[PDB]
Amino acid sequence: MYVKLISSDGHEFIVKREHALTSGTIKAMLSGPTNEVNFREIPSHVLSKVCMYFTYKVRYTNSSTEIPEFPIAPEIALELLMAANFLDC
Amino acid sequence: ETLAPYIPMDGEDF
Amino acid sequence: MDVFLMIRRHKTTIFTDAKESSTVFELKRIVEGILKRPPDEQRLYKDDQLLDDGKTLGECGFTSQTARPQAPATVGLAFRADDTFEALCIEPFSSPPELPDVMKPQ
Amino acid sequence: PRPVLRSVNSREPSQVIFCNRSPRVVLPVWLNFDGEPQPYPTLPPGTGRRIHSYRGHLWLFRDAGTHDGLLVNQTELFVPSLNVDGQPIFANITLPVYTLKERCLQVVRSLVKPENYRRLDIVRSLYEDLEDHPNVQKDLERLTQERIAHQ
């Protein structure tokens, strides 16, 4: 039902499992026949935003609402881009 | 003859 | 609507949603399923304001307009001790590096 | 040899209201009778505007400054139909849910001039991603391909 994602600085992020599967990388890891995943290269200021993206994606995919912009501050954009590329979402 | 779309000038874009 | 939250204690952050009409106590039940501490062993906070069990989240100041999926609202969490007091303590996230020159107005 | 994606010259007027429900400046793009995209006056965020279009004309919508893809009534293309009992037809223009990667590319593109993309310390593959800017022409080719597969 939930998975725990660990950032490089030791912050723990608990998200719903379905949300975590937004990451193609996490989905491939957990796709086989409480779960913990360690990202020692992704800092907490990036990994928190990635989790917000999981929420945003699940909420607004297949929605008729007006969709708000996903905000990315300039100073995190490059690292978030690396993370998104690594995580495939 | 062809008829393309247009915006009426008096249309108060709300 | 739904409010989207981050429940944070120390270096732990829980991402979840709940209805504006659901109560603080119902939110402690959600935490209970994840962190195994029962609601009479949790305190939840909005900033430094302790939230009462009987209040709805909307009544505590959380609104769907501000607690959004892409910018969730923070709920502070503290835990039990049968003879001492655990202060609310949320460890900040890391700080990003300097913007690269090529990314600054030129 | 007329493109699959093109307006038909119906000459049958259709009153439409473009409603920008996005945070972007919207560029409406009309596909003319040869399938060639034509720009029309842009819409600031949160504004709407009355348009005299025609039955079976085709429209798509982009961020005016970047050409990032936008959706209209939740899809790629908008086709006016005949107005029923005077009521105009609404084109509700929204953001799609971009992937996190594409959204990061938008932000990096807005901050960095193309001559400097390759002066960023990121994996080599991301340079070509950054350079692969959104493009109406490539979108039409992809949509045509997709449509033919439905047949």
Coordinates of C-alpha atoms in Angstrom, one line a residue:
Chain A
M1 CA 0.0 0.0 0.0
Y2 CA 3.0 2.4 0.7
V3 CA 6.6 2.6 -0.2
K4 CA 9.5 4.5 1.5
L5 CA 11.9 6.5 -0.7
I6 CA 15.2 7.6 0.9
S7 CA 17.1 10.6 -0.1
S8 CA 20.9 11.1 0.0
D9 CA 20.7 13.1 3.2
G10 CA 18.6 10.5 5.0
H11 CA 15.1 12.0 4.7
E12 CA 12.4 9.4 4.4
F13 CA 9.4 9.9 2.1
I14 CA 6.4 7.7 2.5
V15 CA 4.1 7.7 -0.6
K16 CA 1.2 5.6 -1.8
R17 CA 2.5 2.6 -3.8
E18 CA 0.3 3.5 -6.9
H19 CA 1.7 7.0 -6.8
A20 CA 5.3 5.7 -6.7
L21 CA 4.6 3.6 -9.8
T22 CA 4.4 6.9 -11.7
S23 CA 8.1 6.4 -11.9
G24 CA 8.8 3.9 -14.7
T25 CA 12.1 3.0 -12.8
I26 CA 10.3 2.3 -9.6
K27 CA 7.5 0.4 -11.4
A28 CA 10.0 -1.9 -13.1
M29 CA 11.7 -2.6 -9.7
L30 CA 8.5 -3.4 -7.8
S31 CA 6.6 -5.2 -10.6
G32 CA 7.3 -8.8 -9.5
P33 CA 5.3 -11.6 -7.6
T34 CA 6.6 -1.5 3.6
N35 CA 8.9 -1.6 0.5
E36 CA 12.0 0.6 0.8
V37 CA 14.0 2.2 -2.0
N38 CA 17.2 4.1 -1.4
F39 CA 18.3 7.0 -3.7
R40 CA 21.7 8.0 -2.3
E41 CA 22.2 10.4 -5.3
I42 CA 19.0 12.4 -5.0
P43 CA 18.9 15.1 -2.3
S44 CA 15.8 15.8 -0.2
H45 CA 15.0 19.1 -1.9
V46 CA 14.7 17.1 -5.2
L47 CA 13.1 13.9 -4.0
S48 CA 10.3 15.8 -2.2
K49 CA 9.4 17.5 -5.4
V50 CA 9.4 14.2 -7.3
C51 CA 6.9 12.9 -4.7
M52 CA 4.7 16.0 -5.3
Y53 CA 4.9 15.2 -9.0
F54 CA 3.6 11.7 -8.3
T55 CA 0.6 13.2 -6.4
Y56 CA 0.0 15.8 -9.2
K57 CA 0.1 13.2 -12.0
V58 CA -2.3 10.8 -10.3
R59 CA -4.7 13.6 -9.4
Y60 CA -4.8 15.3 -12.8
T61 CA -4.4 12.5 -15.3
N62 CA -7.8 11.7 -16.8
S63 CA -9.3 14.8 -15.1
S64 CA -11.6 17.4 -16.6
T65 CA -10.5 20.1 -14.2
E66 CA -8.4 23.0 -15.1
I67 CA -4.9 21.7 -14.6
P68 CA -2.5 24.0 -12.6
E69 CA 1.2 24.3 -13.7
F70 CA 3.7 22.0 -11.9
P71 CA 6.0 24.6 -10.4
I72 CA 9.8 24.2 -10.6
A73 CA 12.0 26.9 -9.2
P74 CA 15.1 27.7 -11.4
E75 CA 17.6 26.6 -8.7
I76 CA 16.3 23.0 -8.6
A77 CA 15.5 22.6 -12.3
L78 CA 18.7 20.9 -13.4
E79 CA 18.8 18.4 -10.5
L80 CA 15.1 17.7 -10.9
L81 CA 15.7 17.1 -14.6
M82 CA 18.4 14.6 -13.8
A83 CA 16.1 12.9 -11.3
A84 CA 13.2 12.8 -13.8
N85 CA 15.5 11.2 -16.4
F86 CA 16.8 8.7 -13.9
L87 CA 13.3 7.9 -12.6
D88 CA 11.6 8.0 -16.1
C89 CA 8.6 10.1 -15.2
Chain B
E1 CA -14.5 30.5 -52.7
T2 CA -12.9 29.9 -49.3
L3 CA -14.1 31.3 -46.0
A4 CA -11.5 31.4 -43.2
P5 CA -12.2 32.0 -39.5
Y6 CA -12.1 35.6 -38.1
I7 CA -12.3 37.5 -34.8
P8 CA -15.0 40.3 -34.8
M9 CA -13.3 43.5 -33.9
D10 CA -16.2 44.6 -31.6
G11 CA -16.0 41.3 -29.7
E12 CA -15.2 42.2 -26.1
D13 CA -12.8 39.4 -25.2
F14 CA -13.9 38.5 -21.7
Chain C
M1 CA -12.6 18.8 -2.0
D2 CA -9.4 16.9 -1.2
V3 CA -6.5 18.5 0.7
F4 CA -3.1 17.3 -0.1
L5 CA -0.7 17.1 2.8
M6 CA 2.8 16.4 4.0
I7 CA 2.9 15.0 7.6
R8 CA 6.4 15.6 8.9
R9 CA 8.3 14.5 12.0
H10 CA 12.1 14.6 12.3
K11 CA 13.4 13.2 8.9
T12 CA 10.1 11.4 8.0
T13 CA 7.6 12.9 5.5
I14 CA 4.2 11.2 4.7
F15 CA 2.4 12.2 1.5
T16 CA -1.3 11.7 1.7
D17 CA -4.7 13.3 1.0
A18 CA -7.9 13.6 3.0
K19 CA -11.3 15.3 2.7
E20 CA -11.7 18.8 4.0
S21 CA -14.6 17.5 5.9
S22 CA -12.6 14.7 7.6
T23 CA -11.3 15.3 11.2
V24 CA -7.9 15.6 12.8
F25 CA -8.7 12.3 14.6
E26 CA -9.3 10.6 11.3
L27 CA -6.0 11.9 10.1
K28 CA -4.3 10.4 13.2
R29 CA -5.9 7.1 12.2
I30 CA -4.2 7.4 8.8
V31 CA -0.9 8.0 10.5
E32 CA -1.6 5.1 12.9
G33 CA -1.7 2.7 10.0
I34 CA 1.6 3.9 8.7
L35 CA 3.7 4.6 11.8
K36 CA 2.0 2.3 14.3
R37 CA 1.4 4.9 16.9
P38 CA -2.2 5.3 18.1
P39 CA -4.0 8.7 18.0
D40 CA -3.8 9.3 21.8
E41 CA 0.0 9.0 21.2
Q42 CA 0.2 11.6 18.4
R43 CA 0.0 15.4 18.2
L44 CA -0.6 17.1 14.9
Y45 CA 0.2 20.7 14.2
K46 CA -0.5 23.4 11.7
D47 CA 2.6 25.6 12.1
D48 CA 2.9 25.7 16.0
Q49 CA -0.9 25.4 16.6
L50 CA -1.9 22.0 18.1
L51 CA -4.9 20.7 16.3
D52 CA -7.9 19.5 18.2
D53 CA -9.1 15.9 17.5
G54 CA -12.7 16.9 16.8
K55 CA -12.1 19.6 14.3
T56 CA -12.3 19.1 10.5
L57 CA -9.2 19.9 8.4
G58 CA -11.2 22.7 6.8
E59 CA -11.9 24.0 10.3
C60 CA -8.2 23.9 11.0
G61 CA -7.4 26.1 8.0
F62 CA -6.6 23.6 5.3
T63 CA -8.4 24.3 2.1
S64 CA -8.4 22.5 -1.3
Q65 CA -7.3 25.8 -2.8
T66 CA -4.0 25.9 -0.8
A67 CA -3.2 22.3 0.0
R68 CA -2.7 21.1 -3.6
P69 CA -1.2 18.0 -5.1
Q70 CA 1.8 20.0 -6.5
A71 CA 2.2 22.2 -3.3
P72 CA 0.9 20.2 -0.4
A73 CA 0.3 21.8 3.1
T74 CA 2.5 20.7 6.0
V75 CA 1.1 19.0 9.1
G76 CA 3.6 18.8 12.0
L77 CA 3.7 15.5 13.9
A78 CA 5.0 14.7 17.4
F79 CA 4.9 11.4 19.4
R80 CA 4.3 10.1 22.9
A81 CA 6.3 9.7 26.1
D82 CA 4.7 8.4 29.3
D83 CA 6.8 10.8 31.5
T84 CA 8.5 13.4 29.2
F85 CA 7.5 15.9 26.5
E86 CA 8.5 15.5 22.8
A87 CA 8.8 18.9 21.1
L88 CA 7.7 19.3 17.6
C89 CA 10.8 19.1 15.4
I90 CA 10.8 19.0 11.5
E91 CA 14.3 18.7 10.0
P92 CA 14.5 20.9 6.9
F93 CA 15.2 19.6 3.5
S94 CA 18.6 20.2 1.9
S95 CA 19.4 23.5 0.1
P96 CA 20.0 23.6 -3.7
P97 CA 23.3 24.8 -5.1
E98 CA 24.0 28.1 -6.8
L99 CA 22.3 28.6 -10.1
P100 CA 24.8 28.1 -13.0
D101 CA 26.0 31.2 -14.8
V102 CA 24.5 30.0 -18.1
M103 CA 21.1 29.8 -16.2
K104 CA 21.2 33.4 -15.0
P105 CA 19.9 36.5 -17.0
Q106 CA 22.8 37.4 -19.3
Chain D
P1 CA -3.2 14.7 -52.5
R2 CA -4.9 16.6 -49.6
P3 CA -3.6 16.0 -46.0
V4 CA -5.7 13.9 -43.6
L5 CA -5.6 16.8 -41.1
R6 CA -7.2 19.9 -42.7
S7 CA -10.3 22.1 -42.5
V8 CA -13.1 21.4 -44.9
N9 CA -14.5 24.5 -46.8
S10 CA -18.0 24.1 -45.5
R11 CA -18.9 27.8 -45.6
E12 CA -21.3 26.9 -42.8
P13 CA -20.6 29.4 -40.0
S14 CA -20.1 28.2 -36.4
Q15 CA -19.8 30.6 -33.5
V16 CA -17.1 29.5 -31.1
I17 CA -15.6 30.8 -27.8
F18 CA -11.9 30.1 -27.2
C19 CA -11.6 30.0 -23.3
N20 CA -8.0 30.0 -22.0
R21 CA -8.1 28.0 -18.8
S22 CA -4.3 27.7 -18.6
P23 CA -1.6 29.9 -17.1
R24 CA 0.1 30.3 -20.6
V25 CA -0.4 32.8 -23.4
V26 CA -2.3 30.7 -25.9
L27 CA -1.7 30.7 -29.6
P28 CA -4.7 29.4 -31.6
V29 CA -3.6 27.6 -34.7
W30 CA -6.0 27.0 -37.6
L31 CA -5.3 24.2 -40.1
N32 CA -6.2 25.7 -43.5
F33 CA -7.7 23.8 -46.4
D34 CA -4.3 22.4 -47.4
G35 CA -3.5 21.3 -43.8
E36 CA -1.1 24.2 -43.3
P37 CA -1.1 25.8 -39.8
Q38 CA -2.0 29.5 -39.5
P39 CA -1.6 31.6 -36.4
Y40 CA -4.5 33.6 -34.9
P41 CA -4.4 36.3 -32.3
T42 CA -3.3 35.1 -28.9
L43 CA -5.3 34.8 -25.6
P44 CA -3.8 36.0 -22.2
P45 CA -4.3 33.5 -19.3
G46 CA -7.8 33.4 -18.0
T47 CA -9.4 35.3 -20.9
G48 CA -11.9 34.1 -23.4
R49 CA -12.9 35.4 -26.8
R50 CA -15.6 35.0 -29.5
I51 CA -14.5 33.5 -32.9
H52 CA -16.4 33.2 -36.1
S53 CA -15.3 29.8 -37.5
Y54 CA -17.0 27.2 -39.6
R55 CA -18.3 23.7 -39.5
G56 CA -15.5 21.1 -39.9
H57 CA -12.7 23.5 -39.5
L58 CA -9.7 22.2 -37.5
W59 CA -7.9 24.0 -34.6
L60 CA -5.1 23.3 -32.2
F61 CA -3.5 25.3 -29.5
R62 CA 0.0 26.1 -28.2
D63 CA 1.9 28.2 -25.8
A64 CA 2.6 31.2 -27.9
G65 CA 6.2 31.7 -26.8
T66 CA 7.4 28.1 -26.6
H67 CA 4.9 26.1 -28.7
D68 CA 4.5 23.7 -25.8
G69 CA 1.5 21.5 -26.5
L70 CA -1.9 22.4 -25.0
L71 CA -5.2 20.5 -24.9
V72 CA -8.7 21.7 -26.0
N73 CA -11.7 20.0 -24.5
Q74 CA -9.2 17.5 -23.2
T75 CA -7.9 16.6 -26.7
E76 CA -5.4 17.6 -29.4
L77 CA -7.8 19.0 -32.1
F78 CA -11.0 21.0 -32.0
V79 CA -13.7 20.9 -34.7
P80 CA -16.6 23.4 -34.7
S81 CA -20.0 21.9 -35.2
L82 CA -23.2 23.7 -36.1
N83 CA -24.6 25.9 -33.3
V84 CA -27.8 24.4 -31.7
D85 CA -30.3 27.1 -30.7
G86 CA -28.0 30.1 -30.9
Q87 CA -25.7 28.6 -28.3
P88 CA -21.9 29.1 -29.1
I89 CA -19.5 26.2 -28.8
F90 CA -16.8 26.3 -26.2
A91 CA -13.1 25.4 -26.8
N92 CA -11.7 25.0 -23.3
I93 CA -7.9 25.2 -23.5
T94 CA -5.9 23.6 -20.7
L95 CA -2.5 22.3 -19.8
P96 CA -1.9 18.6 -20.3
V97 CA -0.2 16.7 -17.5
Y98 CA 3.3 17.0 -18.9
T99 CA 5.8 14.3 -17.8
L100 CA 8.2 15.5 -15.1
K101 CA 11.0 15.4 -17.6
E102 CA 9.3 17.5 -20.2
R103 CA 8.3 20.0 -17.6
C104 CA 11.9 20.3 -16.4
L105 CA 13.0 20.7 -20.0
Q106 CA 10.6 23.6 -20.4
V107 CA 12.0 25.4 -17.4
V108 CA 15.6 24.8 -18.4
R109 CA 14.8 26.0 -21.9
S110 CA 13.2 29.2 -20.6
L111 CA 16.4 30.0 -18.6
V112 CA 19.2 29.0 -21.0
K113 CA 19.9 30.2 -24.5
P114 CA 20.3 27.3 -27.0
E115 CA 24.0 28.2 -27.6
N116 CA 24.6 27.3 -24.0
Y117 CA 22.6 24.1 -23.6
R118 CA 25.8 22.1 -23.9
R119 CA 27.6 24.2 -21.3
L120 CA 25.4 22.5 -18.6
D121 CA 26.8 19.6 -16.5
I122 CA 24.1 17.0 -17.2
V123 CA 24.2 13.6 -19.0
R124 CA 25.0 13.9 -22.7
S125 CA 21.6 12.6 -23.8
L126 CA 19.8 15.5 -22.2
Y127 CA 21.4 18.0 -24.6
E128 CA 19.5 16.4 -27.5
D129 CA 16.4 16.4 -25.4
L130 CA 16.8 20.1 -24.7
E131 CA 17.4 20.8 -28.4
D132 CA 14.2 18.8 -29.4
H133 CA 12.0 21.8 -29.1
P134 CA 8.2 21.5 -29.5
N135 CA 7.1 21.9 -33.2
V136 CA 3.7 22.1 -34.7
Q137 CA 4.8 20.4 -37.9
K138 CA 6.2 17.4 -36.1
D139 CA 3.0 17.2 -34.0
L140 CA 0.8 17.1 -37.1
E141 CA 2.9 14.3 -38.6
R142 CA 2.7 12.3 -35.3
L143 CA -1.1 12.8 -35.1
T144 CA -1.6 11.7 -38.7
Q145 CA 0.5 8.5 -38.1
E146 CA -1.6 7.9 -34.9
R147 CA -4.9 8.3 -36.7
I148 CA -4.0 6.0 -39.6
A149 CA -3.2 3.2 -37.1
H150 CA -6.9 3.6 -36.1
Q151 CA -8.0 2.0 -39.4

